[PDB]
Write a structure and sequence with these properties.
Order of helices and strands: EEHEEEHH
Strand content: 25-35%
Number of helices: 3
CATH topology: Beta-Lactamase
Structural class: alpha+beta
PDB class: transferase
CATH superfamily: Longin domain
Assembly: monomeric
Helix content: 25-40%
Strand order of the largest sheet: 2-1-5-4-3
Keywords: Ykt6p, farnesylation, vacuole fusion, snare, Coiled coil, Lipoprotein, Membrane, Phosphoprotein, Prenylation, Transferase
CATH class: Alpha Beta
Entry title: Crystal structure of the longin domain of yeast Ykt6
Name: Synaptobrevin homolog YKT6
Number of domains: 1
Number of strands: 5
Radius of gyration: 14 Å
Largest sheet: 5 strands, antiparallel
Length: about 140
């Protein structure tokens, strides 16, 4: 029923492991008490599936009751959506392509290709909106 999106993030596919450049979550579905551990899980889960994903590869990893939709583009970045196990796939993949197309336009490669960490100029504000908007397709 309630097909939610708990996380959306953009990573830079690197060697060691992907670097999260911009992220947003929606933990309003959990208790105020555990929104700390749940958040931590999301971050770790997102990074884990971003590092596992090769360039030009799209996959959906199942972890418990969540699903990590991830797509690593050739240009070097990788999008990750952590939604409910039964969140509609097609809509999910369409959002990843939207986020990735827009991010690649907004932040040229030289802005994040060689950064040890992320910064404000590498953040994507539209996410704040996309995570709420695309809830329950």
């Amino acid at each position: 029923m309630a097909m939610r999106i708990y996380y959306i993030g953009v990573f830079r596919s690197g060697g060691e492991k992907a670097l999260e450049l911009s992220e947003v979550k929606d933990l309003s579905q959990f208790g105020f008490f555990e929104r700390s551990s749940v958040g931590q899980f999301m971050t770790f889960f997102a990074e884990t599936v971003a590092s596992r994903t090769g360039a030009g590869q799209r996959q959906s990893i199942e972890e418990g009751n969540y699903i990590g939709h991830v797509y690593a583009r050739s240009e070097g970045i990788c999008g990750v959506l952590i939604t409910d196990k039964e969140y509609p796939v097609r809509p999910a993949y369409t959002l990843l392509n939207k986020i990735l197309d827009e991010y690649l336009v907004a932040h040229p490669k030289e802005e994040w290709a060689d950064v040890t960490e992320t910064n404000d100029a590498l953040k994507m504000k539209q996410l704040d909106t996309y995570i709420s908007k695309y809830q329950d397709p």
